[PDB]
Design a protein around this nucleic acid. Structure first.
Ligand SMILES: [K+]
Ligand SMILES: [Mg+2]
Ligand SMILES: [Mg+2]
Ligand SMILES: [Mg+2]
Ligand SMILES: [Mg+2]
Ligand SMILES: [Mg+2]
Ligand SMILES: [Mg+2]
Ligand SMILES: [Mg+2]
Ligand SMILES: [Mg+2]
Ligand SMILES: [Mg+2]
Ligand SMILES: [Mg+2]
Ligand SMILES: [Mg+2]
Ligand SMILES: [Mg+2]
Ligand SMILES: [Mg+2]
Ligand SMILES: [Mg+2]
Ligand SMILES: [Mg+2]
Ligand SMILES: [Mg+2]
Ligand SMILES: [Mg+2]
Ligand code: NA
Ligand code: NA
Lengths: 76, 97, 50, 100, 93
RNA sequence: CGCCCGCCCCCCGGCGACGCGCACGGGGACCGCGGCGGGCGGCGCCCCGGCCCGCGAACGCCCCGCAGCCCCCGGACGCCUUGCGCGGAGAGGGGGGCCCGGGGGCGGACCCCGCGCGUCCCCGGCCGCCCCUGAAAAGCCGGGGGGCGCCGGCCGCGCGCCGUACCGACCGCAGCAGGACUCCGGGGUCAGCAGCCUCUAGCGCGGGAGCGAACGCGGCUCAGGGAAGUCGGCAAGCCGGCUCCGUAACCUCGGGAAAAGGAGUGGCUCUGACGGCCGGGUCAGAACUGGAACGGACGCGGGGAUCCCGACUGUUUACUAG
RNA sequence: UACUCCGCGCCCCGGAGGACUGAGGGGGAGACGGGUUCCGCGGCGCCUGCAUCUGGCCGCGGGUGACUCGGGCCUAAGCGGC
């Protein structure tokens, strides 16, 4: 597992290297109402935490239908 | 818990220098054993027995080619001080000889 | 022990499969007088040496 | 910093059918509260008042932990109503009373 | 000599071996624990490593010497004799 | 010295790869104390004084990492350890590089908060010791010379054979008070891993009842005397922890020596001393007070004056001789 | 060092009480040796030096999964071949 930057996220999605994308909404503690993007790659699992929930919609909408997407949004 | 005693992780229980462990707490609130591997020595000088700078203490097979080299004519075989003596000695000898 | 060769393991395997009684239909088919197999062994009493 | 402004309540509404009146409870708390193992100086910073549904303890500039409120409630119930009830957290300030 | 009158370093033996052995050991051990001047750099940093092996803690040069002491008198006599016999030959070739 | 990764041959090297020790320092785990949150017990009187729970791996990337070793400027009675040790073959100072079985942050994974003595394991730099110097090879890598030439990135596939239950259930003719290698090791009292009580875990083992003779086996007490007993002080008894006082003849000058021999020691309430920009225990002194009592169980030298033999530590007739 | 009451029986199981081993363990696991003693169901003809409804006993069925743990490779003291 390793951390990834925003610019080389949708790039990886551009080269068709991601196998799946998961969106999870964190709303407790130091993870204050932020979301984590976890992309499954052949070698590693890459995760990015956009600083605000709004940024998640844009990027995910920027790769919609390019990689299969999940949602979690645990509220417990 | 009131008991923290563990059991051996190896094939046998004889404690040799290649059978050392340390203890750590796991996410399931359990105490586990992890091997302590031997640390190899880094390459040492030929003329002197001192250690050569710039190379880590890992087996060479797990290093990239750049990580096991030094950028000098005899790099990795002798130190900078030992190289000067050979250069000075060869020049001064071949000038008189 | 728990660290054996396959050769020893195969000879002990045959000993276990052979520790059986005489079947009931065999006793009456052959009209047997002695109905016990005296080649059986018990682990607590025997020395297999295998 | 002991800024106080702390709130604590005990939802006794669940024992409404039985005969536990909140005024005697409030007097017990007032009479047997302790600060620094000393019973003086308590009216200065500790106030407990009967409300509609629970006794409410409001403090100014003073601090203490919910455990103490649980301890006092159990001592009162030991005076009368022993064997029945229980004192269970329900939020970050309040408690409750439910039968065994 | 604030702690003992005469035993010195042989005080580690208690009363266990006799006077002659202890005197001889006093001499030999005092000699073998000492620091010697290095013939290559004139510093007192030579110490014994094994029976006849002496090492300098400054320059790191190893020498073959005597047991218990760096130099022996027979060796000095022999070196002087060799040096003398070497010059006489080189004058007449 | 860094950063982005060429192979084959001859030669030169390295890693694998190594003793013991009293101390000193660092990391981890364990342990304890305080705070906050959740749960429980008992309650004649007290009780914010009791108990339980509060978790974070391998691996990837970035920072930090003492001591050690090295580079630049320049040109010295200084630097520094518990101990040492180092310097014109270049110290101190200022500025840098390398290694460090480790730590922090972010990921793995929507992490209650602080503090401290000790214990065990591992590592580090030193110092000490030897008529004792504390394995080898497969395998892997580097350098020099020569000859050759994509060598890395992404994506896919693959990884054969054998062991694997359980046990002191093993050997002693037995389900025999014998013998049988190793690993993990909490709390209190304490110098202590000793003795005594205990949390966790495990568990009531060739059967029971009555009675309370002799005698036996294992224990306890005993007036006055104190070895008169006996081949023979055999057996039992005396002493014993810690602190202070005081210690002879003789001697291979190292010892003898805990010589011999005296005095104190509980509880409670106080006083002083020793660090750091709260912590910690230890040492010393005083008043009061208990049947003239305090190492209150436990644990734990009886001593002295001489003669013979062997210098001493060591070894020996497994099953009658140490 | 040691059992008792009730279900139910001094010995099995359950609840309650009272004790013990006492972290060099009557604890938790391996090496060697043993070889199925392991697990479930049933049983008391033998054995369990008293009893037994218990059992390492008797009958019937089951149970041991590896690219990463060990062996297979290396060499030691040695042994063999030439
Ligand atoms: K297994
Ligand atoms: Mg390097
Ligand atoms: Mg197993
Ligand atoms: Mg036999
Ligand atoms: Mg036995
Ligand atoms: Mg007499
Ligand atoms: Mg007589
Ligand atoms: Mg006696
Ligand atoms: Mg003798
Ligand atoms: Mg002796
Ligand atoms: Mg004998
Ligand atoms: Mg004898
Ligand atoms: Mg006990
Ligand atoms: Mg097992
Ligand atoms: Mg069974
Ligand atoms: Mg059977
Ligand atoms: Mg392996
Ligand atoms: Mg294998
Ligand atoms: Na003990
Ligand atoms: Na019980």
């Amino acid at each position: 597992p390793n951390t990834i930057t925003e610019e080389n996220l949708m790039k990886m999605i551009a080269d068709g290297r991601g196998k799946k994308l998961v969106v999870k909404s964190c709303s407790k503690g130091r993870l204050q109402g932020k979301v984590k993007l976890k992309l499954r790659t052949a070698k590693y699992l890459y995760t990015l935490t956009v600083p605000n929930a709004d940024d998640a919609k844009s990027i995910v909408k920027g790769c919609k239908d390019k990689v299969e997407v999940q949602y979690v949004n645990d509220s417990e | 818990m009131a008991d923290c005693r563990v059991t051996c992780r190896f094939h046998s229980t004889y404690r040799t220098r290649s059978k050392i462990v340390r203890y750590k707490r796991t996410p399931g609130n359990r105490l586990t054993s992890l091997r302590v591997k031997k640390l190899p020595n880094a390459p040492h000088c030929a003329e002197t027995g001192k250690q050569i700078h710039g190379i880590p203490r890992v087996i060479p097979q797990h290093l990239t080619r750049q990580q096991r080299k030094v950028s000098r004519p005899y790099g990795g075989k002798l130190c900078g001080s030992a190289l000067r003596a050979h250069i000075l000695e060869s020049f001064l000898n071949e000038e008189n000889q | 022990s728990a660290n054996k060769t396959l050769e020893r393991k195969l000879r002990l395997g045959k000993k276990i499969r052979m520790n059986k009684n005489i079947p009931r239909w065999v006793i009456l088919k052959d009209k047997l007088k002695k109905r016990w197999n005296y080649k059986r062994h018990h682990w607590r009493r025997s020395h297999l040496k295998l | 910093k002991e800024q106080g402004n702390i709130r604590f309540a005990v939802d006794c509404s669940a024992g409404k059918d039985l005969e536990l009146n909140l005024n005697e409870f409030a007097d017990y708390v007032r009479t047997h509260f302790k600060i620094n193992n000393r019973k003086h100086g308590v009216a200065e910073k500790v106030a407990c008042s009967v409300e509609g549904d629970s006794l409410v303890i409001q403090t100014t500039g003073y601090e203490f932990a919910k455990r103490y409120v649980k301890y006092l409630t159990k001592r009162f119930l030991y005076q009368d109503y022993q064997g029945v009830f229980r004192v269970l957290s329900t939020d970050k300030e309040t408690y409750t009373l439910k039968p065994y | 000599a604030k702690r003992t009158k005469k035993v010195g370093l042989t005080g580690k033996y208690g009363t266990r071996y006799g006077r002659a052995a202890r005197k001889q050991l006093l001499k030999i051990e005092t000699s073998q624990k000492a620091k010697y001047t290095c013939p290559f750099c004139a510093k007192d940093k030579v110490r014994r490593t094994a029976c006849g092996i002496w090492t300098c803690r400054s320059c790191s040069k190893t020498m073959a010497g005597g047991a218990y002491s760096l130099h022996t008198e027979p060796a000095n006599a022999a070196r002087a004799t060799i040096r003398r016999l070497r010059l006489a030959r080189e004058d007449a070739q």
